TrEMBL record, chain A:
Residues annotated for FMN binding in this entry: 37, 39, 42, 55, 70, 80, 101
PAS domain segment(s): 1-61
Parent-protein start and end of this portion: 48 to 153 of 913
Annotated localization: Cell membrane
Family statement: In the N-terminal section; belongs to the phytochrome family.
Ranges of residues in domain PAC: 62-106
Protein name in UniProt: Circadian input-output histidine kinase CikA
Organism: Chloroflexus aggregans (strain MD-66 / DSM 9485)
Assembly information from the UniProt record: At low DSF concentrations, interacts with RpfF.
Amino acid sequence: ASGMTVTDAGADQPIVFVNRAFSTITGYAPNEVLGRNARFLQGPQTDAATVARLREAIAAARPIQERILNYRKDGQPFWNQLSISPVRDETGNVVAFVGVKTDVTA
Amino acid sequence: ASGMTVTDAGADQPIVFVNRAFSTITGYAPNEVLGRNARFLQGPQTDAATVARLREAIAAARPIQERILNYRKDGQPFWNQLSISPVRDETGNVVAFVGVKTDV
Ligand SMILES: Cc1cc2nc3c(=O)[nH]c(=O)nc-3n(C[C@H](O)[C@H](O)[C@H](O)COP(=O)(O)O)c2cc1C
Ligand SMILES: Cc1cc2nc3c(=O)[nH]c(=O)nc-3n(C[C@H](O)[C@H](O)[C@H](O)COP(=O)(O)O)c2cc1C
């Protein structure tokens, strides 16, 4: 099961929804992540150039796929196969972003 | 502002999330729609051909846009400029569907 996050499009893309697999993968309950930017999943071993490519894609509302080192709540690393896409209305306004997280550590 | 719905991919695509604008447009609170298929928004004057196109698109996980007649909680009809797309993982498994609703 892949984790899924939904964020607001604007401000700092706060998380507005996670699926159950999100909590299985990351160790966080919904109430611990709602209203936060997903960057709290990163740590000192996360690749800064990868974070930069996500930052620039989100600012432009461009879809992006990266493999990124992330951390469970208890501190265990997992390699996150992350896919992020904007949700657009028919005028092209960005309504939200959706993220799909696959734990590809094994 | 455009309404947004997120559903599960499987079974009968039950609604798992709605934004604030969904409630403004439809007059339903989240508690009233969570766990339900969004077809409850349709009613007597809804075009059956339009429903059938949405049904086939969801079954194949194909993106689709339709203008569909829907009904607010209080029974007032409204034109829903609806666009539906699947959310996929990187192996192409469908994880969810996203619907965007504009009252036109
Ligand atoms: C919908 C969505 C989901 C995201 N999921 C993750 C994630 O699972 N792991 C992660 O490291 N970053 C994730 N991000 C990226 C961070 O939120 C952030 O955009 C990234 O760290 C780049 O921005 P920054 O330099 O301001 O931190 C996600 C962003 C969005 C919009
Ligand atoms: C994410 C999502 C959002 C939807 N939103 C609406 C909507 O706003 N109004 C509507 O009439 N149908 C909506 N539908 C369509 C119905 O849920 C259903 O797929 C359609 O009526 C055709 O299938 P049926 O013949 O089994 O009812 C949505 C479906 C999905 C998957």
